């Protein structure tokens, strides 16, 4: 008896924002300044290294925009690193780097620029971008779409950036937001970055939390113990993953276990479908008839 804040006048005059601002999934202020191109290039479709951190997955897509909707050049997911032998830690800094390497290698395989722009074959964990070769075509300009993720130093979203740059893509950046960018003096130390590349931070937690709370070492790392995996092996696991990704990123789907028709048949069963006009005619007639005769 005070507000009636959600009035008919309010709802009539209410402008709803863009459906993906209502879903809270897209920064259009960013997306405009990001996708829009120099018009003197006409049709050179701007590619974006779109990186997304869900729970238990690192989605990383190379997307270019049409008037009708975004399309994908190549797409990688961290759930398909276990083919290369990263079974545990799918959504960590090391997985991000590996998915960044995989998505870069997939594109350059597709586009036929794998032979040149191989990337970095001796990882020191240095900040460096892929230089354009003289007497040859230029490297792939892709721009990192981050979304609603903050630009913090030592983010996995920049793990994927480092992965892609090492994977042979030209993703331009500075060393500011890398793990081990010492804040006081304007310098990167490649030790902590190379640690984070090869899961050094997870492995250096393993031996500390193994000697300390073993109840917490049974809570976490229950898969790492079940695999007989130890704290030392992880550097060589990720090195085997890097080389196997670089050898064969051949874009392998599943076997599709009950095909698209069989899935539709099964999914359509429980989903409630809309009533008709005669359905509501009977419904309201019944809900009137309830009150008609003193209940």
């Amino acid at each position: 008896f005070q507000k009636d804040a959600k009035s008919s006048a309010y709802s009539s005059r209410f402008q709803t924002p863009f459906r993906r601002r209502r879903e809270g999934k897209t920064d259009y202020y960013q997306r405009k300044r990001l996708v829009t191109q120099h018009k003197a290039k006409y049709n050179t479709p701007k590619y974006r290294l779109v990186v997304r951190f869900t729970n238990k997955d690192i989605i990383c897509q190379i997307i270019s925009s049409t008037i009708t909707g975004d399309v994908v050049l190549a797409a990688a997911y961290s759930h398909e690193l276990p083919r290369y032998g990263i079974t545990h830690g799918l959504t960590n800094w090391a997985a991000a780097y590996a998915t960044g390497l995989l998505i870069a290698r997939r594109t350059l395989q597709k586009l036929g620029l794998d032979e040149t722009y191989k990337g970095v074959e001796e990882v020191e964990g240095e900040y460096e971008l892929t230089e354009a070769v003289e007497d040859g075509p230029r490297p792939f300009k892709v721009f990192l779409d981050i979304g609603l993720q903050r630009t913090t130093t030592g983010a996995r979203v920049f793990g994927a950036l480092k992965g892609a740059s090492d994977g042979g893509l030209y993703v331009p950046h500075s060393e500011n937001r890398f793990p081990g960018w010492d804040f006081e003096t304007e310098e990167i130390d490649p030790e902590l970055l190379r640690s984070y590349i090869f899961g050094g931070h997870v492995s250096q937690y393993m031996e500390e939390l193994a000697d300390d709370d073993e109840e917490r070492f049974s809570e976490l790392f229950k898969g790492y113990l079940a695999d007989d995996i130890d704290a030392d092996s992880l550097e060589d696991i990720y090195t085997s993953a890097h080389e196997a990704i670089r050898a064969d990123p051949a874009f392998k789907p599943t076997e599709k276990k009950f095909t698209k028709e069989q899935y539709a048949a099964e999914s359509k069963k429980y989903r409630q479908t809309k009533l008709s006009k005669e359905e509501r005619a009977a419904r309201v007639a019944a809900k009137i008839a309830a009150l008609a005769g003193q209940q």
Partner: protein, 168 residues
């Protein structure tokens, strides 16, 4: 049914408000630092009143918020001073509550003659697990009518835990 509607203290906000910045508020900051174990935040005056004896930008009040088993322990300490007896006022329509303690030397704190005496405002922000949705950056949303911690549920919980009465 009721799997994860656990209804746990989100935070406890301990607020002290002086109309004076300098000697007594540098003391009251050390009081909240002593109790909680966190360097607190000195609130600044919004607009001059000239009746209470404050101006704007004058650093009038100071408060802190605690989260988890600490907040539960300080709420125990504060409730036993209030006798486990809190009026059916003091408990907001959004299922939060609070109370005021006079003479901070209660709660098993020493007098600390170097600083002196102060009053506090306890406010317990009550909440059910999975309320991150409203506060997280990406994919925001409002909790359903089910998950909205209401007055009646905060009252009936405050009875069950702490072994207290509502007095009204």
């Amino acid at each position: 049914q009721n799997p994860m509607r656990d209804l746990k203290i989100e935070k406890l906000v301990l607020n002290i408000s002086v109309g004076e910045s300098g000697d007594r508020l540098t003391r009251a900051s050390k009081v909240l630092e002593q109790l909680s174990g966190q360097t607190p935040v000195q609130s600044k005056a919004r607009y001059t009143v000239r009746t209470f004896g404050i101006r704007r930008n004058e650093k009038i009040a100071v408060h802190v918020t605690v989260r988890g088993p600490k907040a539960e322990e300080i709420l125990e300490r504060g409730l036993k001073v209030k006798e486990y007896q809190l009026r059916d006022r003091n408990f907001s329509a959004t299922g939060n509550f609070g109370f005021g303690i006079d003479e901070h030397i209660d709660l098993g704190i020493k007098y600390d003659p170097s600083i002196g005496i102060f009053g506090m405002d306890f406010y317990v922000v009550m909440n059910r697990p999975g309320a991150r949705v409203t506060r997280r950056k990406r994919c925001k949303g409002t909790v359903g009518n089910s998950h909205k911690t209401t007055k009646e549920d905060t009252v009936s919980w405050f009875k069950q835990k702490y072994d207290a009465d509502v007095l009204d």
